[PDB]
């Protein structure tokens, strides 16, 4: 009973962590673009 | 092991908070470029 909830929470935490990692990669792309546009203006 | 899940919640939370500082910075940058262009 509580071993199913405890197992799904650890499963959930790895899901959230992998989402954060992907979002961090997506954000580092965002930073490249901004620097690339800044360089073009300068 | 339950004390480990609660601290994993804290790790994720602080990571989200760091992600949000970075979002703040990229939104600022896009705004400086937008008004400039």
């Amino acid at each position: 009973q509580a071993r199913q909830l405890l197992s799904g929470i650890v499963q959930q935490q790895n899901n959230l962590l992998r989402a954060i990692e992907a979002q961090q990669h997506l954000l580092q792309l965002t930073v490249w673009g901004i620097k690339q546009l800044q360089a073009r203006i300068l | 092991l339950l004390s480990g899940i609660v601290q994993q919640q804290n790790n994720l939370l602080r990571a989200i908070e760091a992600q949000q500082h970075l979002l703040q910075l990229t939104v600022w940058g896009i705004k400086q470029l937008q008004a400039r262009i």
Binding site: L17, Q24, V31 | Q7, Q8, N11, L12, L25, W28, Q32
Partner: peptide
């Protein structure tokens, strides 16, 4: 923009240490 550059790399390093710290705690858990 200098300062923006500072904070970007700074918080980038921060989140990447939290990610590694979470990869550890996740395997332990």
């Amino acid at each position: 923009w200098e300062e923006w550059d500072k904070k970007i790399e700074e918080y980038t390093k921060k989140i990447e240490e939290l990610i590694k710290k979470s990869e550890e705690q996740q395997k332990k858990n």
